[PDB]
Coordinates of C-alpha atoms in Angstrom, one line a residue:
Chain B
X6 CA 26.7 44.6 -24.7
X7 CA 28.5 47.0 -26.9
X8 CA 29.4 50.7 -26.6
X9 CA 29.5 52.2 -30.1
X10 CA 30.5 55.9 -30.5
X11 CA 29.8 58.0 -33.8
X12 CA 32.4 60.7 -34.1
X13 CA 31.4 63.0 -37.0
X14 CA 31.9 66.4 -38.6
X15 CA 29.1 68.0 -40.3
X16 CA 29.4 71.0 -42.7
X17 CA 26.0 72.0 -43.6
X18 CA 24.2 69.3 -41.5
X19 CA 23.6 66.4 -43.9
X20 CA 26.3 64.2 -42.5
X21 CA 24.7 65.1 -39.0
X22 CA 21.6 63.4 -40.3
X23 CA 23.4 60.4 -41.5
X24 CA 25.3 60.1 -38.2
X25 CA 22.0 60.3 -36.1
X26 CA 20.8 57.4 -38.5
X27 CA 24.0 55.4 -37.9
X28 CA 23.8 56.1 -34.1
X29 CA 20.1 54.9 -34.1
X30 CA 21.3 51.5 -35.8
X31 CA 24.2 51.0 -33.4
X32 CA 22.3 52.6 -30.4
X33 CA 25.5 55.0 -30.2
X34 CA 26.1 58.1 -28.6
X35 CA 27.2 60.8 -30.7
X36 CA 30.0 63.1 -30.7
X37 CA 30.6 66.1 -33.0
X38 CA 33.8 67.5 -34.1
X39 CA 33.3 71.4 -33.9
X40 CA 33.5 73.8 -37.1
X41 CA 37.1 74.3 -35.9
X42 CA 38.2 70.6 -35.9
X43 CA 38.0 70.2 -32.2
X44 CA 36.4 67.5 -30.1
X45 CA 35.6 67.8 -26.5
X46 CA 37.6 65.9 -24.0
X47 CA 34.3 64.0 -23.3
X48 CA 34.4 63.1 -26.9
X49 CA 38.0 61.7 -26.6
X50 CA 37.4 59.9 -23.5
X51 CA 34.2 58.2 -25.0
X52 CA 36.4 57.2 -28.1
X53 CA 39.1 55.5 -25.7
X54 CA 36.2 53.8 -24.0
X55 CA 34.1 52.5 -27.0
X56 CA 34.0 49.2 -28.4
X57 CA 33.4 50.4 -31.9
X58 CA 34.1 53.9 -33.4
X59 CA 32.4 55.0 -36.4
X60 CA 33.8 57.9 -38.4
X61 CA 31.6 60.4 -40.1
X62 CA 32.6 63.2 -42.5
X63 CA 31.4 65.1 -45.7
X64 CA 33.4 64.6 -48.7
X65 CA 34.7 68.2 -49.9
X66 CA 37.1 68.8 -52.5
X67 CA 37.6 65.1 -52.9
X68 CA 38.5 63.9 -49.4
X69 CA 37.4 64.3 -45.8
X70 CA 36.6 67.9 -44.6
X71 CA 39.7 69.7 -43.1
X72 CA 37.9 69.6 -39.8
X73 CA 37.7 65.7 -39.9
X74 CA 41.4 65.5 -40.8
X75 CA 42.4 67.9 -37.9
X76 CA 40.6 65.4 -35.5
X77 CA 42.2 62.4 -37.3
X78 CA 45.8 64.2 -37.0
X79 CA 44.8 64.8 -33.3
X80 CA 44.2 61.1 -32.8
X81 CA 48.0 60.8 -33.1
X82 CA 48.0 61.1 -29.2
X83 CA 45.6 57.8 -28.7
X84 CA 47.7 56.3 -31.7
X85 CA 51.2 56.7 -29.9
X86 CA 49.8 54.8 -26.8
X87 CA 47.8 52.4 -29.2
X88 CA 44.5 53.1 -27.1
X89 CA 42.5 52.0 -30.2
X90 CA 44.2 48.7 -31.0
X91 CA 41.6 46.1 -31.8
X92 CA 38.7 48.2 -31.5
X93 CA 35.9 47.8 -34.3
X94 CA 35.7 50.6 -36.9
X95 CA 33.3 51.6 -39.6
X96 CA 32.7 55.1 -41.5
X97 CA 30.4 57.0 -43.5
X98 CA 30.3 59.9 -45.9
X99 CA 27.9 62.1 -47.9
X100 CA 28.3 64.8 -50.6
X101 CA 26.3 66.8 -53.1
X102 CA 27.7 65.0 -56.1
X103 CA 29.6 61.9 -57.3
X104 CA 30.3 58.8 -55.4
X105 CA 33.2 59.3 -57.4
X106 CA 35.2 61.1 -54.7
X107 CA 33.3 59.6 -51.9
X108 CA 35.2 56.4 -52.0
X109 CA 38.4 58.4 -51.5
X110 CA 36.9 59.5 -48.2
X111 CA 35.8 56.0 -47.2
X112 CA 39.4 54.7 -48.1
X113 CA 40.9 57.4 -45.9
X114 CA 38.7 56.2 -43.0
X115 CA 39.9 52.7 -43.5
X116 CA 43.5 53.9 -43.4
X117 CA 42.8 55.8 -40.2
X118 CA 41.3 52.7 -38.6
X119 CA 44.3 50.5 -39.8
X120 CA 46.8 53.0 -38.5
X121 CA 45.0 52.4 -35.1
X122 CA 45.2 48.6 -35.5
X123 CA 41.4 48.2 -35.7
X124 CA 39.0 45.9 -37.5
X125 CA 37.1 47.4 -40.4
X126 CA 33.3 46.7 -40.9
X127 CA 32.1 46.8 -44.6
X128 CA 28.6 47.5 -45.6
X129 CA 26.6 44.3 -45.2
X149 CA 30.4 48.6 -50.4
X150 CA 33.1 49.4 -48.1
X151 CA 30.8 51.7 -46.0
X152 CA 27.8 54.0 -46.5
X153 CA 27.9 56.8 -48.9
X154 CA 25.2 59.0 -49.6
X155 CA 23.8 61.9 -51.9
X156 CA 23.1 65.5 -50.7
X164 CA 17.7 66.2 -45.4
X165 CA 18.6 63.3 -47.6
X166 CA 16.4 60.4 -48.9
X167 CA 15.0 57.5 -46.3
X168 CA 16.8 55.0 -48.6
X169 CA 20.2 56.3 -47.7
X170 CA 19.2 56.9 -43.8
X171 CA 17.9 53.4 -43.8
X172 CA 21.2 51.7 -45.3
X173 CA 23.2 54.0 -42.7
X174 CA 21.0 52.8 -39.9
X175 CA 21.3 49.0 -41.0
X176 CA 25.1 49.8 -41.0
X177 CA 25.3 51.0 -37.4
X178 CA 23.4 48.0 -36.4
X179 CA 25.9 45.9 -38.3
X180 CA 28.9 47.6 -36.6
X181 CA 27.4 47.3 -33.2
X182 CA 26.8 43.6 -33.9
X183 CA 30.4 43.1 -34.6
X184 CA 31.6 45.1 -31.7
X185 CA 29.5 42.7 -29.6
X186 CA 31.0 39.6 -30.9
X187 CA 34.4 41.0 -30.8
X188 CA 34.6 43.0 -27.6
Chain O
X6 CA 38.8 26.5 -33.8
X7 CA 39.3 28.6 -37.1
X8 CA 39.8 27.6 -40.7
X9 CA 41.9 30.3 -42.4
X10 CA 42.9 30.0 -46.3
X11 CA 45.6 31.7 -47.6
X12 CA 44.9 32.4 -51.5
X13 CA 47.7 33.9 -53.3
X14 CA 49.5 34.6 -56.7
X15 CA 53.4 34.5 -57.0
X16 CA 55.2 35.9 -60.0
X17 CA 58.8 34.9 -59.3
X18 CA 58.1 33.2 -55.9
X19 CA 58.6 36.2 -53.2
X20 CA 55.0 36.4 -52.7
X21 CA 54.9 32.4 -52.4
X22 CA 57.5 33.0 -49.3
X23 CA 55.4 35.6 -47.7
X24 CA 52.2 33.4 -48.1
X25 CA 54.0 30.4 -46.2
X26 CA 54.8 32.8 -43.4
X27 CA 51.3 34.1 -43.2
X28 CA 50.0 30.4 -43.4
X29 CA 52.4 29.6 -40.6
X30 CA 51.0 32.2 -38.2
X31 CA 47.5 31.6 -39.1
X32 CA 48.1 27.7 -39.3
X33 CA 46.2 28.2 -42.7
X34 CA 46.0 26.0 -45.7
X35 CA 47.7 27.4 -49.0
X36 CA 46.0 27.8 -52.3
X37 CA 47.9 29.1 -55.3
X38 CA 46.5 31.1 -58.3
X39 CA 48.3 29.5 -61.1
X40 CA 50.4 31.6 -63.9
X41 CA 47.2 32.1 -66.0
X42 CA 44.8 33.4 -63.0
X43 CA 43.1 30.2 -62.3
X44 CA 42.4 28.4 -59.0
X45 CA 41.3 24.9 -58.7
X46 CA 38.0 23.8 -57.6
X47 CA 39.5 22.7 -54.5
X48 CA 40.7 26.3 -53.9
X49 CA 37.2 27.8 -54.5
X50 CA 35.7 25.2 -52.2
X51 CA 38.2 26.0 -49.6
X52 CA 37.3 29.6 -49.7
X53 CA 33.7 29.0 -49.4
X54 CA 34.4 26.9 -46.2
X55 CA 36.9 29.4 -44.6
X56 CA 36.3 31.3 -41.6
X57 CA 39.2 33.8 -42.9
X58 CA 40.5 34.5 -46.2
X59 CA 43.9 36.1 -46.6
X60 CA 44.6 37.4 -50.2
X61 CA 48.3 37.4 -51.5
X62 CA 49.7 39.3 -54.4
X63 CA 52.6 40.8 -55.9
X64 CA 52.5 44.6 -56.7
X65 CA 53.3 44.9 -60.3
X66 CA 53.1 48.2 -62.4
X67 CA 51.3 49.7 -59.5
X68 CA 48.5 47.3 -58.6
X69 CA 47.8 43.6 -58.0
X70 CA 49.2 41.3 -60.5
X71 CA 46.7 40.6 -63.5
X72 CA 46.6 36.8 -62.3
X73 CA 45.4 38.1 -58.9
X74 CA 42.7 40.4 -60.6
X75 CA 41.5 37.7 -62.7
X76 CA 40.9 35.5 -59.7
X77 CA 39.3 38.4 -58.0
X78 CA 37.0 39.0 -61.1
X79 CA 36.0 35.2 -61.0
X80 CA 35.0 35.7 -57.3
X81 CA 32.1 37.6 -58.9
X82 CA 30.5 33.9 -58.7
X83 CA 30.8 33.7 -54.8
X84 CA 29.9 37.5 -54.7
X85 CA 26.6 37.1 -56.3
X86 CA 25.4 34.4 -53.9
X87 CA 27.0 36.3 -51.0
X88 CA 29.0 33.1 -50.1
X89 CA 31.7 35.2 -48.3
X90 CA 29.4 37.6 -46.3
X91 CA 30.9 38.4 -42.8
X92 CA 34.0 36.2 -43.2
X93 CA 37.2 37.8 -41.7
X94 CA 39.7 39.1 -44.5
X95 CA 43.3 40.1 -44.5
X96 CA 46.0 40.5 -47.4
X97 CA 49.6 41.0 -48.1
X98 CA 51.9 42.1 -50.8
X99 CA 55.5 42.5 -51.8
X100 CA 57.4 44.1 -54.5
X101 CA 60.8 45.0 -55.5
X102 CA 60.4 48.7 -54.8
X103 CA 58.4 51.4 -53.1
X104 CA 56.0 50.8 -50.5
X105 CA 54.7 53.5 -52.7
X106 CA 52.5 51.5 -54.9
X107 CA 52.2 48.6 -52.5
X108 CA 49.5 50.6 -50.5
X109 CA 47.5 50.7 -53.6
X110 CA 47.4 46.9 -54.0
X111 CA 46.6 46.6 -50.3
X112 CA 43.8 49.0 -50.8
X113 CA 42.5 46.9 -53.5
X114 CA 42.4 44.0 -51.2
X115 CA 40.4 45.9 -48.7
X116 CA 37.8 47.0 -51.5
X117 CA 37.7 43.2 -52.7
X118 CA 36.8 42.2 -49.1
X119 CA 34.3 44.9 -48.7
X120 CA 32.6 43.9 -51.9
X121 CA 32.1 40.6 -50.3
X122 CA 30.8 42.0 -47.1
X123 CA 33.7 40.9 -45.1
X124 CA 35.5 42.3 -42.0
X125 CA 39.0 43.6 -42.5
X126 CA 42.0 43.0 -40.1
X127 CA 44.7 45.5 -40.0
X128 CA 48.4 45.0 -39.0
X129 CA 48.5 44.7 -35.3
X149 CA 49.5 49.5 -41.2
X150 CA 46.7 48.3 -43.3
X151 CA 48.3 44.8 -43.9
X152 CA 51.9 43.6 -44.3
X153 CA 53.9 44.8 -47.1
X154 CA 57.5 43.7 -47.9
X155 CA 60.6 44.4 -50.0
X156 CA 61.9 42.0 -52.8
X164 CA 64.1 35.1 -50.4
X165 CA 63.2 38.1 -48.2
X166 CA 64.3 39.4 -45.0
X167 CA 63.2 37.5 -41.8
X168 CA 61.9 40.7 -40.3
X169 CA 59.2 40.9 -43.0
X170 CA 58.6 37.1 -42.8
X171 CA 58.2 37.5 -39.1
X172 CA 55.7 40.4 -39.1
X173 CA 53.9 38.5 -42.0
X174 CA 53.6 35.5 -39.6
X175 CA 52.4 37.6 -36.6
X176 CA 49.7 38.9 -38.9
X177 CA 48.6 35.4 -40.0
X178 CA 48.3 34.7 -36.4
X179 CA 46.3 37.9 -35.8
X180 CA 43.8 37.1 -38.7
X181 CA 43.1 33.6 -37.3
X182 CA 42.5 35.1 -34.0
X183 CA 40.0 37.4 -35.0
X184 CA 38.4 34.5 -37.3
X185 CA 38.2 32.5 -34.0
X186 CA 36.6 35.2 -32.0
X187 CA 34.1 36.0 -34.9
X188 CA 33.4 32.9 -36.4
Chain E
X6 CA 49.0 67.4 -85.8
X7 CA 48.8 65.0 -83.0
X8 CA 48.3 61.3 -83.1
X9 CA 46.2 59.7 -80.2
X10 CA 45.6 56.1 -79.7
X11 CA 42.7 54.7 -77.7
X12 CA 43.8 51.3 -76.2
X13 CA 41.0 49.6 -74.4
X14 CA 39.4 46.5 -73.1
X15 CA 35.7 45.6 -73.3
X16 CA 34.0 43.0 -71.4
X17 CA 30.3 43.2 -72.6
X18 CA 31.0 46.1 -75.3
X19 CA 29.9 49.1 -73.1
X20 CA 33.5 50.2 -72.8
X21 CA 33.8 49.5 -76.6
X22 CA 31.1 52.4 -77.3
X23 CA 32.8 54.8 -74.7
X24 CA 36.2 54.2 -76.6
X25 CA 34.5 55.0 -79.9
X26 CA 33.1 58.2 -78.5
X27 CA 36.8 59.2 -77.1
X28 CA 38.4 58.1 -80.4
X29 CA 36.1 60.4 -82.3
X30 CA 36.8 63.4 -80.1
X31 CA 40.4 62.8 -80.4
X32 CA 40.2 61.6 -83.8
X33 CA 42.1 58.7 -82.5
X34 CA 42.9 55.2 -83.8
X35 CA 41.3 52.4 -81.8
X36 CA 43.2 49.2 -80.5
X37 CA 41.5 46.5 -78.5
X38 CA 43.1 44.4 -75.7
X39 CA 41.4 41.0 -76.4
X40 CA 39.3 38.8 -74.0
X41 CA 42.7 37.2 -73.0
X42 CA 44.6 40.5 -72.3
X43 CA 46.5 40.5 -75.3
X44 CA 47.3 43.3 -77.8
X45 CA 48.5 42.8 -81.2
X46 CA 51.9 44.1 -82.3
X47 CA 50.4 46.6 -84.3
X48 CA 48.7 47.9 -81.0
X49 CA 52.2 48.2 -79.2
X50 CA 53.9 49.8 -82.2
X51 CA 51.0 52.4 -82.4
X52 CA 51.4 53.0 -78.8
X53 CA 55.1 53.5 -78.9
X54 CA 54.4 56.1 -81.9
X55 CA 51.4 57.9 -80.4
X56 CA 51.7 61.6 -79.0
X57 CA 48.7 60.6 -76.5
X58 CA 47.5 57.3 -75.0
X59 CA 44.2 57.0 -73.8
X60 CA 43.3 54.0 -71.6
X61 CA 40.0 52.4 -71.6
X62 CA 38.7 49.6 -69.1
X63 CA 35.6 48.5 -67.4
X64 CA 35.4 48.6 -63.7
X65 CA 34.8 45.1 -62.4
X66 CA 35.1 44.0 -58.7
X67 CA 36.3 47.4 -57.9
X68 CA 39.2 47.7 -60.3
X69 CA 40.3 47.4 -63.9
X70 CA 39.3 44.2 -65.5
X71 CA 42.0 41.6 -65.4
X72 CA 42.4 41.9 -69.1
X73 CA 43.3 45.5 -68.9
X74 CA 45.8 44.8 -65.9
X75 CA 47.4 42.0 -68.1
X76 CA 48.0 44.6 -70.7
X77 CA 49.4 47.1 -68.1
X78 CA 51.7 44.5 -66.7
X79 CA 53.0 43.7 -70.3
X80 CA 53.7 47.6 -70.8
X81 CA 56.6 46.7 -68.3
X82 CA 58.5 46.5 -71.6
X83 CA 58.0 49.7 -72.8
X84 CA 58.5 50.9 -69.3
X85 CA 61.9 49.7 -68.8
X86 CA 63.2 51.4 -72.1
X87 CA 61.1 54.6 -71.2
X88 CA 59.5 54.5 -74.4
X89 CA 56.4 56.4 -73.3
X90 CA 58.1 59.1 -71.1
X91 CA 56.5 62.6 -71.6
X92 CA 53.6 61.2 -73.5
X93 CA 50.3 62.6 -72.8
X94 CA 47.8 60.3 -71.3
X95 CA 44.0 60.0 -70.4
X96 CA 41.7 57.4 -69.3
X97 CA 38.0 56.3 -69.0
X98 CA 35.9 53.6 -67.3
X99 CA 32.3 52.4 -67.2
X100 CA 30.4 50.1 -65.1
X101 CA 27.0 48.8 -64.2
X102 CA 26.9 50.6 -60.6
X103 CA 28.6 53.0 -58.3
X104 CA 31.0 55.8 -59.4
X105 CA 32.1 54.5 -56.1
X106 CA 34.5 52.1 -57.5
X107 CA 35.1 53.7 -60.7
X108 CA 37.3 56.3 -59.1
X109 CA 39.6 53.4 -58.1
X110 CA 40.1 52.3 -61.9
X111 CA 40.7 56.0 -62.9
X112 CA 43.2 56.3 -60.1
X113 CA 45.0 53.1 -61.2
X114 CA 45.3 54.7 -64.8
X115 CA 46.8 57.7 -63.5
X116 CA 49.4 55.6 -61.7
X117 CA 50.1 53.7 -64.8
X118 CA 50.7 56.9 -66.7
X119 CA 52.7 58.1 -63.8
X120 CA 55.0 55.0 -63.8
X121 CA 55.6 55.7 -67.5
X122 CA 56.3 59.4 -66.8
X123 CA 53.5 60.9 -68.8
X124 CA 51.4 63.8 -68.3
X125 CA 47.8 63.4 -67.1
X126 CA 44.9 65.1 -68.7
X127 CA 42.1 65.6 -66.3
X128 CA 38.3 66.0 -67.5
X129 CA 37.8 69.7 -68.7
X149 CA 36.5 65.1 -62.7
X150 CA 39.7 63.2 -63.1
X151 CA 38.7 61.3 -66.3
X152 CA 35.2 60.2 -67.6
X153 CA 33.3 57.6 -65.9
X154 CA 29.9 56.3 -67.0
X155 CA 26.8 54.2 -66.1
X156 CA 26.1 50.7 -67.9
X164 CA 24.5 51.3 -75.2
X165 CA 24.9 53.9 -72.8
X166 CA 23.3 57.6 -72.5
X167 CA 24.2 60.4 -75.0
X168 CA 25.2 62.4 -72.1
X169 CA 28.1 60.1 -71.1
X170 CA 29.1 59.6 -74.8
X171 CA 29.2 63.4 -75.4
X172 CA 31.3 64.0 -72.1
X173 CA 33.5 61.2 -73.4
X174 CA 34.0 62.6 -76.8
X175 CA 34.7 66.1 -75.4
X176 CA 37.2 64.5 -73.3
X177 CA 38.9 62.8 -76.3
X178 CA 39.0 66.3 -78.1
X179 CA 40.5 67.6 -74.8
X180 CA 43.3 65.1 -74.7
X181 CA 44.3 65.5 -78.4
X182 CA 44.4 69.2 -77.9
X183 CA 47.0 68.9 -74.9
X184 CA 48.9 66.3 -77.0
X185 CA 49.3 68.8 -79.9
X186 CA 50.4 71.6 -77.6
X187 CA 52.8 69.2 -75.9
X188 CA 54.2 67.2 -78.8
Chain R
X6 CA 58.6 82.1 -69.8
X7 CA 56.7 80.3 -67.1
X8 CA 55.5 81.3 -63.8
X9 CA 55.4 78.5 -61.2
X10 CA 54.1 78.8 -57.7
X11 CA 55.0 76.4 -54.8
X12 CA 52.2 76.5 -52.4
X13 CA 52.9 74.3 -49.3
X14 CA 52.3 73.5 -45.5
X15 CA 55.2 72.4 -43.2
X16 CA 54.6 70.9 -40.0
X17 CA 57.9 70.5 -38.4
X18 CA 60.0 72.3 -41.4
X19 CA 61.0 69.1 -43.6
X20 CA 58.3 69.8 -46.2
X21 CA 59.6 73.4 -46.1
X22 CA 63.1 72.1 -47.3
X23 CA 61.5 70.0 -49.9
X24 CA 59.5 73.1 -51.2
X25 CA 62.8 75.2 -51.4
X26 CA 64.3 72.4 -53.6
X27 CA 61.2 72.3 -56.0
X28 CA 61.1 76.1 -55.9
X29 CA 64.7 76.0 -56.9
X30 CA 64.3 73.6 -59.7
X31 CA 61.3 75.4 -61.1
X32 CA 62.5 78.8 -60.2
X33 CA 59.2 79.1 -58.4
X34 CA 58.0 81.7 -55.8
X35 CA 57.1 80.2 -52.5
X36 CA 53.9 80.5 -50.5
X37 CA 53.3 78.8 -47.2
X38 CA 49.9 77.8 -45.7
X39 CA 50.2 78.9 -42.2
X40 CA 49.8 76.6 -38.9
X41 CA 46.3 77.4 -39.1
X42 CA 45.5 76.4 -42.8
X43 CA 45.4 79.8 -44.1
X44 CA 47.1 81.3 -47.0
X45 CA 47.6 85.1 -47.6
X46 CA 45.7 87.0 -50.2
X47 CA 49.1 87.2 -51.9
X48 CA 49.2 83.6 -52.1
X49 CA 45.8 83.2 -53.8
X50 CA 46.4 85.9 -56.3
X51 CA 49.8 84.3 -57.0
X52 CA 47.9 81.0 -57.7
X53 CA 45.4 82.5 -59.9
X54 CA 48.1 84.1 -61.8
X55 CA 50.6 80.9 -62.1
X56 CA 51.1 78.8 -65.3
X57 CA 51.8 75.9 -62.8
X58 CA 50.9 75.2 -59.2
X59 CA 52.8 72.7 -57.2
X60 CA 51.2 71.5 -54.0
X61 CA 53.4 70.6 -50.7
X62 CA 52.3 68.8 -47.9
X63 CA 53.3 66.5 -45.1
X64 CA 51.8 62.9 -44.8
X65 CA 50.4 62.7 -41.4
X66 CA 48.0 60.1 -40.1
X67 CA 47.8 58.7 -43.5
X68 CA 47.0 61.7 -45.5
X69 CA 47.7 65.3 -46.3
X70 CA 47.9 67.7 -43.0
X71 CA 44.7 69.1 -42.0
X72 CA 46.1 72.6 -42.7
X73 CA 46.8 71.5 -46.2
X74 CA 43.2 70.1 -46.8
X75 CA 41.7 73.2 -45.3
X76 CA 43.6 75.1 -47.8
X77 CA 42.3 72.6 -50.5
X78 CA 38.8 73.2 -49.3
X79 CA 39.2 76.9 -49.6
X80 CA 40.1 76.5 -53.3
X81 CA 36.5 75.7 -53.7
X82 CA 36.3 79.5 -54.3
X83 CA 38.9 79.4 -57.3
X84 CA 37.3 76.0 -58.4
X85 CA 33.6 77.5 -58.8
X86 CA 34.8 80.0 -61.1
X87 CA 37.2 77.6 -63.0
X88 CA 40.2 80.1 -62.3
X89 CA 42.6 77.1 -62.2
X90 CA 41.3 75.4 -65.4
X91 CA 44.1 74.0 -67.6
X92 CA 47.0 75.0 -65.4
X93 CA 49.8 72.7 -64.8
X94 CA 50.0 70.9 -61.5
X95 CA 52.6 68.9 -59.5
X96 CA 53.0 67.7 -56.1
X97 CA 55.2 66.5 -53.3
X98 CA 55.2 65.1 -49.7
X99 CA 57.6 63.8 -47.2
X100 CA 56.9 61.9 -43.8
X101 CA 58.8 60.1 -41.2
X102 CA 57.9 56.7 -42.3
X103 CA 56.5 54.5 -45.0
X104 CA 56.1 55.6 -48.5
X105 CA 53.1 53.4 -47.6
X106 CA 50.8 56.4 -46.9
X107 CA 52.8 58.8 -48.8
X108 CA 51.1 57.5 -52.1
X109 CA 47.6 58.5 -50.6
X110 CA 48.6 62.0 -50.1
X111 CA 50.1 62.3 -53.6
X112 CA 46.9 60.7 -55.0
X113 CA 44.9 63.4 -53.2
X114 CA 47.0 66.1 -54.8
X115 CA 46.3 64.4 -58.4
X116 CA 42.5 64.5 -57.5
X117 CA 42.7 68.1 -56.2
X118 CA 44.5 69.0 -59.5
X119 CA 41.7 67.1 -61.5
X120 CA 39.0 68.8 -59.7
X121 CA 40.4 72.0 -60.8
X122 CA 40.6 70.7 -64.5
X123 CA 44.5 70.7 -64.6
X124 CA 47.1 68.6 -66.1
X125 CA 49.2 66.5 -63.8
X126 CA 53.0 66.2 -64.1
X127 CA 54.4 62.9 -62.9
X128 CA 58.1 62.4 -61.7
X129 CA 60.3 62.3 -64.8
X149 CA 56.8 57.8 -59.8
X150 CA 53.6 60.0 -59.6
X151 CA 55.5 62.8 -57.8
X152 CA 58.4 63.1 -55.4
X153 CA 58.1 61.5 -51.9
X154 CA 60.7 61.5 -49.2
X155 CA 61.9 60.3 -46.1
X156 CA 62.2 62.5 -42.8
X164 CA 67.0 68.3 -42.9
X165 CA 66.6 65.4 -45.5
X166 CA 68.9 63.6 -47.8
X167 CA 70.4 65.3 -50.8
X168 CA 69.3 62.5 -53.0
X169 CA 65.6 63.4 -52.0
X170 CA 66.4 67.2 -52.4
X171 CA 67.9 66.8 -55.8
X172 CA 65.1 64.4 -57.1
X173 CA 62.8 67.2 -55.7
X174 CA 64.6 69.9 -57.6
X175 CA 64.5 68.0 -60.8
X176 CA 60.9 67.6 -60.5
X177 CA 60.4 71.4 -60.2
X178 CA 62.4 72.0 -63.3
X179 CA 60.3 69.3 -65.0
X180 CA 57.1 70.9 -64.1
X181 CA 58.3 74.4 -65.1
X182 CA 59.3 72.9 -68.3
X183 CA 55.9 71.7 -69.0
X184 CA 54.2 74.9 -67.9
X185 CA 56.5 76.7 -70.6
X186 CA 55.3 74.4 -73.4
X187 CA 51.8 74.5 -72.1
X188 CA 51.1 78.0 -71.1

């Protein structure tokens, strides 16, 4: 039965709450990219051992936080050895404004998953996005999503 | 064992060759959106009965052909009844120029799959894109991709 | 003093109201892509004679309506002769749901303008998007935008 | 007569050569985001005093380098006071592979410009992209682009 990892950055702690919600649904372990865009070696090992990787980031100035992208750039290492090929991926984001820009962040997360040769799990539209504490409605859709990713990861392990 | 459908539009017949290649890899049936953006009732029934749906379209003026989008718009019908929820999706495109714009077409295809609540299969980056007859290199990567989608569709049926 | 054209498709008539609003701000003439994705020869002549072209379309299944894209595809003709090079462009969209997808439609409109070698006028974020009659708040931001495009088109004629 | 600033990040120095080329065409000053995503106070002052801002970044793992995005995120400061409203913007990118992903980087640069309420100058498609020293063909198209941005910035000052 599946091992899902939620790897996320929070600037301000709203994407932290959404990650807890997704972790709860997927019964995932949580790994935090720090304020400097760094993940511990425990995080990276967990990602290489996961059946599913769910990416979390704020949308800031129209895209994923620089801290998330620094982590994405550093996944060039697992990418060159195809360590994450065929894993199940999902994502989430949350900002203070328009789902406008949030779709851009989600679309990057899909590209990052594709670059790694993974399978992308859509919301059961592309992935959860949310307004910025946070409404229970958003936390609930987030939690359902995490359960939906774990589910695919089980079927597809 | 899985039923994959390749549903595609070709303006000029280069995306037709790429579809045959993907169909060969997935051992799929082929269904053509006509020059007016119409799919037969046989096509639509096949899509509702498929384990995997692979979308094919030219990239023209920076996006999917109008004929493909007319078909996408008409999939609002299966979308309202969630007929394609949890199906496995992939895509492909081909134009006469820059993979520039082709990524935009592929990204639409991912959105269309997400809108339907499907799972997206990346190239084993997001999906095959090709230059515009067509090189064997592109046809081969296309065929491998179709085999890779069928494979996921089998595991995940 | 500048000639702005608003060229738009409305499925259902909500993007028609938004176009009237943008036309009012820019003091533009209005040209409608019909239900079949066709523009009159009067429309096409007006576009070739405009200092500014503002594109209007619904967001449907995650992108511009097929009728808008059919028109975009047909602008391949003015594109091959570079008829619209250096013109000032803007856009707008409106749907029944998430500004999620609406950003995708706006981003296509930017690509279409770029393909034509035009200059893109942002909202004074990328262009107006709106919920779907329609709120006065949205109509007002739309009208301000049309005045802002005409303004650039005057400066930059 | 116009003041254009080229503000760029280079990982590896290929986007540095492209920036020199754009600077040459626009007769711009050059300002480098360092390896840590930091711009000097001289850079930021230059950006606030520019008639045109041209953004330069590598495409890495499917998007702008983390160092570029850290700079973009830090432009939240000029953004809150609308310091860059109505400025003329352009962009460029260069990677070792598919113009696939490069369009995504360019599209972010357009969003960043829009967020700031600027005008976007397309290649006279959206902006220059290039393969990765670098071919003279790419450097030349880049230089022409920088001249084309300065030109708009003069007209539109």
